[PDB]
């Protein structure tokens, strides 16, 4: 139950640069199993992130050592900070160092959330033998797909500016001797904090005299590389995940920006080692289970003690050889919305998932919520088309979903404020008499056409409540140039009909009797995603005045059966 | 920078019962200054409360020892748990014990939030010399006035049931060997968590077969003692605060249930020792500065590092004799809403506070928001009266304010959902052309009359935004039997006109040009307060069917100048 803490122990990397760590070590006779956390937001500040993770001091009382490290160039660590690029090598050297210490019994694990989760995948691919398990929570193994861009090839601009500004504020606040221009830089950073959509609204987007100066990576890496090119593959871990045999306790949230990629990591490692999955109804900044228009119940609050118990059982199994430690612990545990209950599963995706087409249709125009758009499991008998004008100067505002910094505390947002927009097409089933469970990956196949040589298409799945609330579930986007590949974009011919796939990530929701299933289709979702210029140019470099409007069209009927693919579960 | 942690060190009280503590002690040559935290929610679980307090590990790295204690009868501590009653003696014996240890240099301080704040006042009154400073955050020195009842003599029923159930769940979850009936007891407790208004809705209120069994104090002490009698004075610290000379760093929140009493502690100790005040726009469960319909800005987020710095400066001054440590640190720091800025003051109440009457008036009925009720600095020229029916079966629902467990995450709640009720009288100024700052204690003097021999009257101050939002600021209630004294209630004669005072706690808000100042007057605010039966009986014992409706009346004009007293600040 007793332990000691040593601060600012300097660990040398291969290049001579030393990273700072704190050592939480139990009162032990010999060497102990060790847990490593790699953190860019000050290893000293444990309270800021731990509430979203585990009561990990319990690990130390139970005989684990915990090592928390400032990443390179931040706080007590030497070197220069650039996101992602140094973390593979630094983690590898750090694990090596730990394995050489007298207090390490040769078993090392990791845990942490977000960036503290990503860093675990970056550590795992080094193949270091002593690393026996990781527990990456709300993390990604493909930085392009999350959180900076996405599978649809659009820039997550609110994510980028919100985070960069958080790092900027952090760099200024942590400075030894304050520079004179700090205060001015700060006011700009606080302004971004209070109005991320405003900062994302400037054109050209790539012109960030503030953020591009405080942290040049924001432009040099992210904004300047809209294609999933070599710069991105260089830091991507995902393709190497299949070759690994490292157990992973993976945590995600239905409304968390990383959810798509978190789930994909599980699918990629489950066949080669003991993987575990836990998914709750949380967003990045809200793990209470309470939202403005949607309450998931007290049991949906991030169950920190249950997580602590599970992590410990996980580590006891893999770092201490306790063969029975994970007895009774499910492989997959999901919070199933609608019924609003935790439920254990044997796999993700669920076995007996029926990937079911729900076809777009209806008489008249599907524009707005009072239009005639329908969803049905039967193909629409009549060939029609819905048409709207998308104008970059007036994009569809983001409401909930997987937003990170711009109002990222209200995932299951009521969609009624945007229901009357002409560029928001609505399609919904009739009122349900039997519950319909949708749990798994969600995507849409749309037959589309544009007046422009590039544009976007969005799809959002929505649960319509009897009282009128239209609650967002999951959403996705496709940038048409990237409709076939995120690597080698080609433009489109105006007027030509394309079949495009829209990756809407995932969800778990029972649509109860009395509810409707609704899909919203549009061509913007700002600032969750930057807005397409409709020009085929380099979007982030275009002035707004120089962008074009586009007349976009959704085709539906027997020859163009646009549909959403729902993962139907029937029990 | 280095330290060690010892767990479950048993400290013997005067009666032989041993309380458990954890010792966070720096690597030191000799004895060190010590900080004590008394906690009923597991001393091990530091992450749960610390984010609402300080980064206190910084104190340990800087050479302070920190002692965290399980209160009597909870977790690792021996004995039996009853709220409040053992905490004076236990704190005194604990301080004595600390002062006897080899690692204590004879200087002791405390810090903590809520119950961890109350316990500091309970410690301070023991007169132990080694206790040099306390830092009670969102605390009270009068348990009747907060959080269980209030200055108006109404029961804070959502506070009582919400907390009791939290303690109940805690007792079950912490049990060594689970009893068989635990699971059944739990479901009832989780049901209370998800629907506190429902549990508060039962009649008779005093019939709590669950909570009264898990924790009998809920009835034996709280529900059964609606009068501020000897049972309450026995645990009240407030009258002894004047005799103290202990510096206190006092933190409060404008929407926190303890705010009234927190502020009063400052007023009671400021003349005898170095007191400090910090007040932010927070409620108990929401310190983000973000609410459903009201955003206070990133700077309003609980500034945990700035608090840590201030606490440390405070302790360095009073526990380490660093005479200059508090140089540049303001006496009072308020978050002033409206302008939404932090601001330093030299005193609370503010010097040059102009306690200004705003008179009720207007032609026609003031019922609902579309009535004709007015507020004016001139006495209403015409004698009129507003009249409504209050029916206990249909009370005015609580919206924001200082709610604790029932939707306590939305203090500045938009009041429009209750604006059309006939029993909600609205009075407002014309649209403002000049800013009006209201910062200080707020109260109302109403000329009232009832058809009943007892009833309630409520008053709520509201900022009406140009866009229509009617944001709650502070509110209060008066239970008519307690209109003169909370100790010796007398009933009222039906039809007789009384001048009653309604303590509306406090606020700090600039009503900007384009806004209106609004007051809502009614006779219920449920479940923030239990509902008056209108019978003169023992309210908590009455069946709903047996309660009466009351025809209540607000009198206004030259002979009955009902008014709200606003603390006007002009700079």
Curated annotation (Swiss-Prot), chains A, B:
<dbReference type="InterPro" id="IPR005674">
    <property type="entry name" value="CocE/Ser_esterase"/>
</dbReference>
<feature type="region of interest" description="2">
    <location>
        <begin position="142"/>
        <end position="237"/>
    </location>
</feature>
<feature type="binding site">
    <location>
        <position position="115"/>
    </location>
    <ligand>
        <name>substrate</name>
    </ligand>
</feature>
<dbReference type="GO" id="GO:0008239">
    <property type="term" value="F:dipeptidyl-peptidase activity"/>
</dbReference>
<comment type="subunit">
    <text>Homodimer. The protein aggregates upon heat inactivation.</text>
</comment>
<dbReference type="InterPro" id="IPR000383">
    <property type="entry name" value="Xaa-Pro-like_dom"/>
</dbReference>
<keyword id="KW-0378">Hydrolase</keyword>
<comment type="pathway">
    <text>Alkaloid degradation; cocaine degradation.</text>
</comment>
<dbReference type="Pfam" id="PF02129">
    <property type="entry name" value="Peptidase_S15"/>
</dbReference>
<dbReference type="GO" id="GO:0052689">
    <property type="term" value="F:carboxylic ester hydrolase activity"/>
</dbReference>
<keyword id="KW-0719">Serine esterase</keyword>
<dbReference type="InterPro" id="IPR008979">
    <property type="entry name" value="Galactose-bd-like_sf"/>
</dbReference>
<dbReference type="InterPro" id="IPR050585">
    <property type="entry name" value="Xaa-Pro_dipeptidyl-ppase/CocE"/>
</dbReference>
<dbReference type="GO" id="GO:0005737">
    <property type="term" value="C:cytoplasm"/>
</dbReference>
<comment type="similarity">
    <text>Belongs to the CocE/NonD hydrolase family.</text>
</comment>
<comment type="function">
    <text>Hydrolyzes cocaine to benzoate and ecgonine methyl ester, endowing the bacteria with the ability to utilize cocaine as a sole source of carbon and energy for growth, as this bacterium lives in the rhizosphere of coca plants. Also efficiently hydrolyzes cocaethylene, a more potent cocaine metabolite that has been observed in patients who concurrently abuse cocaine and alcohol. Is able to prevent cocaine-induced convulsions and lethality in rat.</text>
</comment>
<feature type="binding site">
    <location>
        <position position="41"/>
    </location>
    <ligand>
        <name>substrate</name>
    </ligand>
</feature>
<feature type="region of interest" description="1A">
    <location>
        <begin position="1"/>
        <end position="141"/>
    </location>
</feature>
<dbReference type="InterPro" id="IPR029058">
    <property type="entry name" value="AB_hydrolase_fold"/>
</dbReference>
<dbReference type="GO" id="GO:0050784">
    <property type="term" value="P:cocaine catabolic process"/>
</dbReference>
<feature type="active site" description="Acyl-ester intermediate">
    <location>
        <position position="114"/>
    </location>
</feature>
<dbReference type="Pfam" id="PF08530">
    <property type="entry name" value="PepX_C"/>
</dbReference>
<keyword id="KW-0963">Cytoplasm</keyword>
<feature type="active site" description="Charge relay system">
    <location>
        <position position="256"/>
    </location>
</feature>
<feature type="region of interest" description="3">
    <location>
        <begin position="352"/>
        <end position="571"/>
    </location>
</feature>
<protein>
    <recommendedName>
        <fullName>Cocaine esterase</fullName>
        <ecNumber>3.1.1.84</ecNumber>
    </recommendedName>
</protein>
<feature type="active site" description="Charge relay system">
    <location>
        <position position="284"/>
    </location>
</feature>
<dbReference type="InterPro" id="IPR013736">
    <property type="entry name" value="Xaa-Pro_dipept_C"/>
</dbReference>
<feature type="region of interest" description="1B">
    <location>
        <begin position="238"/>
        <end position="351"/>
    </location>
</feature>
<feature type="site" description="Probably involved in activating the substrate carbonyl and the acyl enzyme for hydrolysis">
    <location>
        <position position="41"/>
    </location>
</feature>
């Amino acid at each position: 139950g007793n332990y000691s803490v040593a601060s600012n122990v300097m660990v040398p990397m291969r290049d001579g640069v030393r990273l700072a760590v704190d050592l939480y070590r139990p009162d032990a006779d010999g060497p102990v199993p060790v847990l490593l956390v790699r953190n860019p937001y000050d290893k000293f500040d444990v309270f800021a992130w731990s509430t979203q993770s585990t009561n990990w001091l319990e690990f130390v009382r139970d005989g684990y050592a915990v090592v928390i490290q400032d990443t390179r160039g931040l706080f007590a660590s030497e070197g220069e900070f650039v996101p992602h690029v140094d973390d593979e090598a630094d983690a590898e050297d750090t694990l090596s160092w730990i394995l050489e210490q007298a207090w390490c019994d040769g078993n090392v694990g990791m845990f942490g959330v977000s960036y503290l989760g990503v860093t675990q995948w970056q550590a795992a691919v080094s193949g270091v033998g002593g690393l026996k398990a990781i527990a990456p929570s709300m993390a990604s193994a493909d930085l392009y797909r999350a959180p900076w861009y996405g599978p649809g090839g659009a820039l997550s601009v609110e994510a980028l500016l919100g985070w960069s500004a958080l790092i900027g504020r952090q760099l200024i606040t942590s400075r030894s001797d304050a520079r004179p221009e700090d205060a001015a830089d700060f006011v700009q950073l606080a302004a971004i904090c209070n109005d991320v959509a405003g900062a994302a609204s400037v054109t050209p987007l790539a012109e960030q005299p503030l953020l591009g100066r405080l942290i040049p990576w924001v432009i040099d890496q992210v904004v300047d590389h809209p294609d999933n090119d070599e710069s991105w593959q260089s830091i991507s871990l995902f393709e190497r995940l299949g070759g690994l045999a490292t157990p992973a306790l993976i945590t995600a949230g239905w409304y968390d920006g990383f959810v798509g990629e978190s789930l994909r990591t599980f699918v990629a490692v489950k066949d080669n080692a003991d993987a575990r999955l836990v998914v709750g109804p949380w967003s990045h900044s809200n793990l209470t289970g309470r939202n403005a228009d949607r309450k998931f119940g007290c049991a949906a609050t991030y169950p920190i003690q249950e997580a602590t118990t599970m992590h410990k059982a996980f580590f006891d199994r893999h770092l201490r050889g306790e063969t029975d430690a994970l007895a009774g612990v499910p492989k997959v545990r999901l919070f199933v919305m609608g019924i609003d209950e935790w439920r254990d599963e044997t796999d993700w995706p669920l076995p007996d998932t029926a990937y079911t087409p729900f076809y777009l249709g209806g008489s008249g125009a599907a524009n707005t919520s009072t239009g005639g758009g329908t969803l049905s499991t039967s193909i629409s008998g009549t060939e029609s088309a819905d048409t709207y004008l998308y104008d970059p100067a007036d994009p569809v505002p983001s409401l909930g979903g997987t937003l990170l910094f711009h109002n990222g505390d209200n995932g299951p947002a009521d969609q009624r404020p945007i229901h009357d927009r002409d560029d928001v097409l609505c399609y919904s089933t009739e009122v349900l008499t039997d519950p319909v469970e949708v749990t798994g990956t969600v995507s849409a196949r749309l037959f589309v056409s544009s007046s422009a040589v590039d544009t976007d298409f969005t799809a959002k799945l929505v649960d319509v409540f009897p009282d009128g609330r239209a609650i967002a579930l999951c959403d996705g986007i496709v940038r048409m140039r990237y409709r076939e590949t995120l690597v080698n974009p080609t433009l489109i011919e105006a007027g030509e009909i394309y079949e495009v796939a829209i990756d809407m990530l995932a969800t778990s929701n029972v649509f109860l009797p009395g509810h409707r299933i609704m899909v919203q289709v549009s061509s913007s979702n700002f600032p969750k995603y930057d807005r397409n210029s409709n020009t085929g140019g380099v979007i982030a470099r275009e002035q707004l005045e120089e962008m074009c409007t586009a007349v976009n069209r959704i085709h539906r009927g027997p020859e163009h059966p646009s549909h959403i693919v729902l993962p139907i579960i029937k029990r």
